């Protein structure tokens, strides 16, 4: 096993961790700036986090897609090495008053998420916590689906003293997660993108959501959301999991809507 993990392991001579400085001033907890040296001697700016882990490492290392956050490696508390994301999380970015993304830009972000999700689904990977705050943006504003495998619990803060509104009806009732339940969460994420990061169901309790959805009540169309995109969101919130579109069908449908702008 210590053999099979070698290609995931980063040698202490290849990584300089800057333990004296955190990224995003506490927003992501104790995540440090880091410098990783590759085989050609190129310096890679990275984010280093302190945390059977060696196995989630092997699997995550082989997951490569431009819309999925990659795992740069692990250093043996053991350390998780990830690419540096210049513009932090997607929820934070769309909420920031300073930024003015267009309806096209917002749809483009949703398409990149669908592409990242289409790739994870093909590798039979179930996310379980898909939401705007769990997606990152790099220097070129490329969306990376994050908060899975070794990069999970990004927002778990240490003290001294379930994302139910993104969950599918069957997941709320049986605690079982599938690709079809990630399709439901993707619908909620599209709704967040179109509302520029507004909270879903603000007047409904986390305990009242099951009864609210069983009554056939759903998130309402955002003001600036095109009609075909809203039709796609409602398909994602269908009560029968088998009736929901697949992630590949989502990419096809969303890319054709994106191309009309
Ligand atoms: C654990 C903790 C934090 C993350 C988020 C993350 C990965 N790279 C980054 N670069 C800049 C800012 C934030 C991040 C993922 C797992
Ligand atoms: Cl920013």
Curated annotation (Swiss-Prot):
Parts of the chain on the Cytoplasmic side: 1-261
Protein kinase domain ranges (all copies): 17-261
Post-translational note: Dephosphorylated by PTPN1 and PTPN2.
Positions carrying Phosphothreonine: 206
Active site (catalytic residues): 129 (proton acceptor)
Phenotype when changing residue 33 to R: In RCCP; causes malignant transformation in cell lines
Resulting phenotype, residue 120 to V: In RCCP; somatic mutation
Binding locations of ATP: 23-31, 49
Effect ascribed to mutating residue 113 to L: In RCCP; germline mutation
Subcellular location, record wording: Membrane
Coiled coil (residue ranges): none
Modified residues (Phosphotyrosine): 155, 159-160
Effect of residue 167 to T: In RCCP; somatic mutation
Complex and partners: Heterodimer made of an alpha chain (50 kDa) and a beta chain (145 kDa) which are disulfide linked. Binds PLXNB1. Interacts when phosphorylated with downstream effectors including STAT3, PIK3R1, SRC, PCLG1, GRB2 and GAB1. Interacts with SPSB1, SPSB2 and SPSB4. Interacts with INPP5D/SHIP1. Interacts with RANBP9 and RANBP10, as well as SPSB1, SPSB2, SPSB3 and SPSB4. SPSB1 binding occurs in the presence and in the absence of HGF, however HGF treatment has a positive effect on this interaction. (Microbial infection) Interacts via extracytoplasmic residues 25-656 with L.monocytogenes InlB; MET can bind HGF, its endogenous ligand, and InlB simultaneously. InlB probably dimerizes upon binding to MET, which encourages subsequent dimerization of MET.
Function: Receptor tyrosine kinase that transduces signals from the extracellular matrix into the cytoplasm by binding to hepatocyte growth factor/HGF ligand. Regulates many physiological processes including proliferation, scattering, morphogenesis and survival. Ligand binding at the cell surface induces autophosphorylation of MET on its intracellular domain that provides docking sites for downstream signaling molecules. Following activation by ligand, interacts with the PI3-kinase subunit PIK3R1, PLCG1, SRC, GRB2, STAT3 or the adapter GAB1. (Microbial infection) Acts as a receptor for Listeria monocytogenes internalin InlB, mediating entry of the pathogen into cells.
Domains: entry comment: The kinase domain is involved in SPSB1 binding.
Family in the record: Belongs to the protein kinase superfamily. Tyr protein kinase family.
Disease linked to the protein: Activation of MET after rearrangement with the TPR gene produces an oncogenic protein.
Name assigned to this protein: Hepatocyte growth factor receptor
Organism expressing this protein natively: Homo sapiens
Gene: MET
Region of the whole protein represented: 1062 to 1344 of 1390
